Amino acid sequence: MIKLNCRPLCQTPTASRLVSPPCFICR
Amino acid sequence: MNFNVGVDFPSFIAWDGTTSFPVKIDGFNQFGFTFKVIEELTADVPFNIFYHEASEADPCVPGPAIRVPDVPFCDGVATADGLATVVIPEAVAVDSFCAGSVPCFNGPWISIAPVTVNADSAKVQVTVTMKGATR
Amino acid sequence: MNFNVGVDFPSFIAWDGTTSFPVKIDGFNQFGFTFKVIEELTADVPFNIFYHEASEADPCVPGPAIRVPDVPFCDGVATADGLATVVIPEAVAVDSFCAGSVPCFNGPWISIAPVTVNADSAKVQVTVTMKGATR
Amino acid sequence: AWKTAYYAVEKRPMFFEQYEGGSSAWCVKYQFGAEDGGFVGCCEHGRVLRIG
Amino acid sequence: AWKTAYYAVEKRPMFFEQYEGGSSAWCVKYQFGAEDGGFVGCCEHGRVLRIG
């Protein structure tokens, strides 16, 4: 059972939209 | 600066997805494998590692294949049947490569072939590399 | 004792005799080819060297093939058309390997294919070796 | 009020040794371990906020 | 010409050790080993004669 060594050929982490609190609404 | 790397670190095809080619490690004192995938897999693909002895009639042609014997490491597990093998998982991405080598040299030639031939087997490529010349 | 040489010096298939596979050289700052034969040749077989670049629809897929330009050395002849090529001699023996690499990088991908596909171009195998990962 | 809402208890720190029963003339082995524990104190001394 | 046709490399002499992992109260076991090697130099500086 040979154990392998792995790592990828890409360096582009996908962008994640940041979300901020919306405007106030009366409860 | 670029370099003629192949002069000191040559490489040879071992498994192209359709046929297996013997690789002669006699002339070099170290070596290792390299695995790559070319398309998404369906199920895991295990591989058998072989070695060859020089044919009694001609020293330039290899003999029949013989399975490599497993060896335990400094402590712990051993193979169920004592024969070395390699398995490539599904989680491996298309854009990456894997590397691994046996601890023992054994016969002058080496070879690798899949356990069973199927569609998933053809989706893999294996290449061998040698690190040091001695002739 | 051998090593997992594929960790430091991976190799990838570039021409298996029926298809040519683009290879990525972005993360490695040196590289080179390696040639081998599997049968007696009938005549010389020339090859063309191409390079690619990031495709428009995705930054991780190569675009159309761009022919590599020539680079005359310190002092010497230059190609008749200003493009790099490799010619495999007819006298090459089955039990030998040839190594050569281009002086310049160009795009982050590379490729190779014969000038004309025929029964004689299937008798060669080309593999690319890397060195010096930069990530 | 954590000082009464949760406690942490420690018995023995870490240690390292060499296993003579596996150390042949060509290999070595090492062993290490430690012991720790903890238990919840007064339940009512804490509060948790969640979305509903 | 032997001084340039074949080389002998010496690294470490032989040693003896007592294997504790197998030395029970009623048996004894010992271990020994050494490391050396050799390689060929000039292939043109030698000849061999055989019956044809």
Instruction: Write the single-letter amino acid at B67.
Output: R
Interface probe for A, chosen from B49, B97, B112 (most Cβ of A below 10 Å), is B97
H/E stretch holding D5 reads helix D2-5
- Report the candidate in C26, C34, C14 with the shortest Cα–Cα distance to residue C133: C26
For residue D27, which residues of chain B lie inside 8 Å, CB to CB?
74-75
Interface probe for B, chosen from C3, C4, C5 (most Cβ of B below 10 Å), is C5
Q: How far B75 CA lies from chain D's nearest CA (Å)?
A: 9
Instruction: Give the Cα-Cα-Cα angle B13, B6, B63 (nearest 5 degrees).
Output: 40
Contact B2 C31 (CB under 8 A): yes
**Residues, chain E, total?**
52
- In this structure, what token pair is assigned to residue D28? 């070595």
Q: Which residue of A has its CA nearest to C24?
A: A9
Q: Which residue of D has its CA nearest to E17?
A: D25
Q: How far C10 CA lies from chain B's nearest CA (Å)?
A: 6
Does A10 reach chain C within 8 Å, measured CB to CB? yes
Q: B94 vs A9, A22, B107, B126, CA distance in Å?
A: 9, 40, 33, 14
DSSP states along C57-106: S-TTSB-S-EEPBP---SS----TTSB-EEEE-TT--TT-EE----S---
- Of the CA atoms within 13 Å of residue C67, those in its CB half-sphere come to 11
Partner residue facing A2 (CB), from B95, B96, B102: B102
Rounded Cα distance between D39 and E1, Å, is: 81
Rounded Cα distance between B110 and B26, Å, is: 9
Contact residues for C12 (Cβ-Cβ < 8 A; gap 6+): B34, B36, B97, B125, B127, C21, C23, C127, C128, C130
C67: how many CB neighbours lie within 10 A of its CB?
A: 14
Instruction: Find where tokens 């007819």 sit.
Output: C90
| Technique behind the model | cryo-EM
Q: E25's torsion region: left (phi>0), alpha (psi -120 to 50) or beta?
A: alpha
The resolution, in Å, is 3.4
* DSSP secondary structure letter of residue C20: B
For residue E17, which residues of chain D lie inside 8 Å, CB to CB?
25
Q: Which residue of B has its CA nearest to A11?
A: B95
Q: How far C87 CA lies from chain A's nearest CA (Å)?
A: 31
Question: Do the Cβ atoms of B1 and C1 come closer than 8 Å?
Answer: no
Contact residues for C89 (Cβ-Cβ < 8 A; gap 6+): C44
Partner residue facing C34 (CB), from B6, B33, B102: B6
Rounded Cα distance between B69 and B46, Å, is: 16
**Residues, chain B, total?**
135
Does C135 reach chain A within 8 Å, measured CB to CB? yes
H/E stretch holding C7 reads none
Q: E40 vs B49, B130, C2, E13, CA distance in Å?
A: 30, 20, 20, 22
- In this structure, what token pair is assigned to residue B85? 């093998």
Question: Do the Cβ atoms of C22 and C52 come closer than 8 Å?
Answer: yes
Instruction: Find where tokens 């002092």 sit.
Output: C75
- Of the CA atoms within 13 Å of residue C94, those in its CB half-sphere come to 9
- In this structure, what token pair is assigned to residue C130? 């890397």
Subunits with 3+ C-beta pairs closer than 8 A to C:
A, B
* DSSP secondary structure letter of residue C125: E
What are the E-state strand segments in B1-135? Answer: 11-15, 23-24, 31-37, 45-54, 62-67, 85-88, 96-99, 109-114, 124-130
Rounded Cα distance between C127 and B96, Å, is: 17
Size of interface A-B (CB pairs under 8 A): 35
H/E stretch holding B69 reads none
B28: how many CB neighbours lie within 10 A of its CB?
A: 20
